[PDB]
Ligand binder design. Structure first.
Ligand SMILES: O=C(O)[C@H]1O[C@H](O[C@@H]2[C@H](O)[C@@H](O)[C@@H](O[C@@H]3[C@H](O)[C@@H](O)[C@H](O)O[C@@H]3C(=O)O)O[C@@H]2C(=O)O)[C@H](O)[C@@H](O)[C@H]1O
Length: 138
């Protein structure tokens, strides 16, 4: 396993056809997970499962620019479960990030940060045991 929070460098940023795969297990009584695709200090794509927001489970996605969070995009389909292993796949497409969990499509997030080749780090944090983090061009 890998120490959380974990930094995965994305050399030369992201580009359409690049697939980022995260494997791990949700801890018991998890509160949150976060995948933060960063352009320097900016967060181009915050992918943020929340297990207990007012007794509901929800996937929140957002962008941070100049330390200002933007308008959230929320998805109530929630494929994660405390205690269970997961796979998150983030496929970069020309106009959005496409996310699949356990091989089932979950959501898409339109690119707000336009300089894809400057989104050069993925931060992985939260209540997980992290097994692997990698990318491939498809
Ligand atoms: O429980 C609450 O309602 C909570 O609300 C605020 O915090 C929320 C949120 O829960 C925090 O996690 C944080 O979210 C930031 C960011 O602001 C948001 O736009 C982005 O999508 O996610 C971020 C993240 O995950 O870190 O801040 C939120 C906020 O409203 O400010 C209160 O700050 C907190 O005290 C609590 O009441």
């Amino acid at each position: 396993p890998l120490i959380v929070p974990y930094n995965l460098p994305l050399p030369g940023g992201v580009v359409p056809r690049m697939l980022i795969t995260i494997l791990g297990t949700v801890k018991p009584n998890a509160n949150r997970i976060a995948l933060d695709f960063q352009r320097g200090n900016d967060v181009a794509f915050h992918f943020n499962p929340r297990f207990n927001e007012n007794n509901r489970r929800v996937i929140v996605c957002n962008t941070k620019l100049d330390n200002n969070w933007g308008r959230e995009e929320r998805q109530s389909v929630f494929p994660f479960e405390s205690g269970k292993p997961f796979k998150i796949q983030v496929l970069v497409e020309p106009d959005h990030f496409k996310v699949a969990v356990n091989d089932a499509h979950l959501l898409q997030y339109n690119h707000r940060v336009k300089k894809l080749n400057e989104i050069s780090k993925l931060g992985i944090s939260g209540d997980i045991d992290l097994t692997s983090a990698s990318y491939t061009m498809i």
